[PDB]
Design a binder for this molecule. Structure first.
Ligand code: HEM
Ligand code: HEM
Ligand SMILES: O=C(CCCNc1ccncc1)N[C@@H](Cc1ccccc1)C(=O)O
Ligand SMILES: O=C(CCCNc1ccncc1)N[C@@H](Cc1ccccc1)C(=O)O
Ligand SMILES: *N[C@@H](Cc1ccccc1)C(=O)O
Ligand SMILES: *N[C@@H](Cc1ccccc1)C(=O)O
Lengths: 451, 450
């Protein structure tokens, strides 16, 4: 009945607990001490962090709870606008864009993106083939180069050409810095010293809008059709309203795809490769499948679907380190959570996904072990025990994109190289809007298989 | 490219090879001679028996192969109906019952069945505690009493009371006799089988009448239990929104008893056989049982901690998987192993005991009983170990079977020392399943109270 709460800081309540560079990991440690639910207070803010499948399955009841914009999402909305991820469910543009974009993200739609995904994946493999002996790979850096370029190409047929660069494309520099500012504001008491941050934030917003608005304008003037999301958004109409997306919302969707999609996906690939080199038996089983299935120089769409064990590796990586580590909900009406926590209408909840995925009552005692065999039969996973892509109608629209992209790339990586954990890398998880293993490096010895 | 085939008998092709009391062991011997794949033909039938992990890992690709009803399953369907085990994947009632029943067979659902499993397990232990000196245990007989009573209690809150009986409950007599007729039909319709046909229909009626009565009795009473019948009367398929009808519920209950009891009792009997044949392994398992089972009654959490007992059971399943085969058909034209082209509809049989003896997977000591092989599931190649079938058509009862077997074997190892007093020679009887016929032991109580 009485809800636990972590240590407080006088008038600041729990807010200084987030004044740390690893807030998700701090919140996981708090959940370890306090259990399946704890209250978190800040000035003008009250929320409750959920960690058990028992309570989270109730929070995922869409008749009782709807998606809430966390403070992180509210600050990201300053440049993601009313794109899909930072829209409220009741805003006209959410359901409108949802209806228009859902067919463009289906499993069937991945067939049309596959060639562009292979384009960037080949660039990654060729980069690694061209490294000299005893040179090493900066894993999250290269994975981010790949995910950003892949979403740029599939999103609006634009090449950031990240594998030709040390310094990222100016758009990416502003995007990353806009994301940093949004997350930094959370742990912030906005005195005059943050005036430089505010000025830079508006400059980065303009850089992103200008490039995306220019590409939309360029595409409309040309009239060209590609296999990208931009073409689908220029031509698609919402069956409900009968309306197409306007040019401003299309810009916010493109910005959203880059922001919401690139970092979670590169983090997944980096964590998956980390767990593979830390678990050689798993790596051998995954590499066997990649060699058996990927019999052609370029993987086909159908071949990627056959990489079953690679998909199990990826899901187990998402279980331990879900790269989008939380989502937020609010009570649609007064309701009682778990039969003992009464909530009033509007009360907020946070789903702490890494803790959910460590619920021993669901996964057993070996929760911290990396065992892709947990996912050998998907039906053995209880409802709402595994939520790396969120919940319900507000779940990740990019889920099939992310998993096709990650399965393809990890498959090709395992087909073409043996990997050495040459530094015995100590896992260090950097936190931004997402999670990723900072400083993860490996050596790749080519199997000398041509492309 | 050219597929081997065992000796033929003119117009009967390979069919007389199955006119034997141990057809699985005969098929294993054929695989020893012919290798990883051989064609098997009978009048109006062609199939291919697979024995290597190399080919079986491809056969387990659900995008290329779906479950086929073998001739055995087709004959079992005459009384199991469109229950889960004898339905095609494309039948509406398969996916419907699958969606409804899957939560009631989960690892989490075992917590609710645990008390009823303990009920029957205690009856088994008490029977053995009450034996006189120099009396012995008939192991497969007692294990079958246990598993049948456990599924009756957890399935529909019915007590067959097998430990109070010499002659089985009438339902069991008809069920066993219907299974025997189904398997006998394989190796076989002249006028002489008219008695078999008449008896077969009588046993079907006995099974339907009792199960239909229990369903009707439950609906009339309205009482709720922690059994599968209650879940089926109240559950609705999330996809269609429909509940199972009373006829299908009857087929599911019949299926649980037919598909679950004999495989599970065979596993326990084989596991105890291997334990008494391997005293060092027995001691390690008994050491774990004493360390873990510190209470008079095992808890659910304690059974989950019987790690080595679980490895013992898995190794018993490796050597003698009590459901010895499953059947598949090619969804489209496809090439198996890069050298065996198959047409759409072509049939495959997975010979599980041979798969589990693939030296390229397990090493040269394939015939040795070493539970330590299963210490790390990630070290086992894909599809090397298939005692519970494959994919969405895998055994829905896997968690039920392993929980019951771990609980019961744990209690057996806690409470008794076992003597292989006859130096028993393994003799595997074949029905629909496999079990060690005539396996007997003596149990000396450790005098630990319940
Ligand atoms: C491993 C990769 C990914 C993970 C773990 C992930 C995770 C998530 C999560 C947890 C949510 C729900 C957020 C909330 O409820 O507040 C979400 C929503 C969303 N994601 Fe992803 N995501 C991934 C990849 C992608 C990709 C590749 C794209 C697009 C190219 C994408 C686009 C979106 C969008 C648009 C939404 C909002 C959908 C809506 O509310 O209508 N994501 N994602
Ligand atoms: C050691 C014990 C057991 C073993 C080795 C075993 C083995 C198997 C195998 C190999 C299959 C797949 C058959 C095929 O593909 O044709 C299967 C399916 C099935 N088993 Fe078991 N089983 C065991 C225990 C149980 C129990 C205790 C139950 C129920 C109480 C059960 C119910 C079922 C059902 C319903 C199916 C069909 C599932 C479906 O197709 O949807 N089994 N079993
Ligand atoms: O809730 C969040 C934001 C989670 C990121 N969500 C997302 C990513 C990608 N795509 C869609 C959605 N974070 C937690 C943890 C946190 C982070 C930073 C500071 C404090 C706390 C939160 O509690 O807000
Ligand atoms: O394929 C079979 C039947 C396998 C039993 N399947 C099963 C058991 C329990 N639960 C679900 C499913 N048998 C083999 C071997 C055989 C037996 C009898 C006669 C001939 C051959 C087969 O090839 O048919
Ligand atoms: N991810 C949470 C973190 C937070 C909680 C409470 C106050 C401020 C920030 C969010 O973005 O809301
Ligand atoms: N288990 C097999 C046995 C069989 C093979 C070939 C012809 C008839 C029977 C089956 O049940 O189909």
């Amino acid at each position: 009945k009485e809800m636990p709460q972590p240590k407080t800081f006088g008038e600041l309540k729990n807010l200084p607990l987030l004044n740390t560079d690893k807030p998700v990991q701090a919140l996981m440690k708090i959940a370890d001490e306090l259990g399946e639910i704890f209250k978190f207070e800040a000035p003008g803010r009250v929320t409750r962090y959920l960690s058990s499948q028992r309570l989270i399955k109730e929070a995922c009841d869409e008749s009782r709870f709807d998606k809430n914009l966390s403070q992180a999402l509210k600050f990201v909305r300053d440049f993601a606008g009313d794109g899909l991820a930072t829209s409220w469910t009741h805003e006209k543009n959410w359901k409108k864009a949802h209806n228009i974009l859902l067919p463009s993200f289906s499993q069937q739609a991945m067939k049309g993106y596959h060639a562009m995904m292979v384009d960037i994946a080949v660039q990654l493999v060729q980069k690694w083939e061209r490294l000299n002996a005893d040179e090493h790979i900066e894993v999250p850096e290269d994975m981010t180069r790949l995910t950003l370029d892949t979403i740029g190409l599939c999103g609006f047929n634009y090449r950031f050409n990240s594998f030709y660069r040390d310094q990222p494309h100016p758009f990416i520099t502003s995007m990353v810095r806009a994301l940093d500012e949004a997350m930094n504001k959370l742990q912030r008491p906005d005195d005059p010293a943050y005036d430089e941050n505010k000025r830079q934030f508006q400059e980065d917003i303009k850089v992103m809008n200008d490039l995306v608005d220019k590409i939309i304008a360029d595409r409309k003037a040309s009239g060209e059709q590609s296999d990208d999301l931009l073409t689908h958004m220029l031509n698609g109409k919402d069956p409900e309203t009968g309306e197409p997306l306007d040019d401003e919302n299309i810009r916010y969707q493109i910005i959203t795809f880059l922001i919401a999609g690139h970092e979670v996906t590169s983090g997944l690939l980096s964590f998956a490769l980390y767990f593979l080199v830390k678990n050689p038996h798993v790596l051998q089983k995954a590499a066997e499948e990649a060699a058996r299935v990927l019999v052609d120089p370029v993987p086909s769409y159908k071949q990627v679907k056959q990489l079953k064990y690679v998909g199990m590796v990826l899901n187990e990586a998402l279980r331990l380190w879900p790269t989008a580590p939380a989502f937020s909900l609010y009570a649609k009406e007064d309701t009682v959570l778990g039969g003992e926590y009464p909530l009033e209408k509007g009360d907020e909840l946070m789903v702490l996904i890494p803790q959910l995925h460590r619920d021993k009552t669901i996964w057993g005692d070996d929760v911290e072990e990396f065992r892709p065999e947990r996912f050998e039969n998907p039906s053995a996973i209880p409802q709402h025990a595994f939520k790396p892509f969120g919940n319900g109608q507000r779940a990740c629209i990019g889920q099939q994109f992310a998993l096709h992209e990650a399965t393809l790339v990890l498959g090709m990586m395992l087909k073409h190289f043996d990997f050495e954990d040459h530094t015995n890398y100590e896992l260090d998880i950097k936190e931004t809007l997402t999670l990723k293993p900072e400083g993860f490096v490996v050596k790749a010895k080519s199997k000398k298989i041509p492309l």
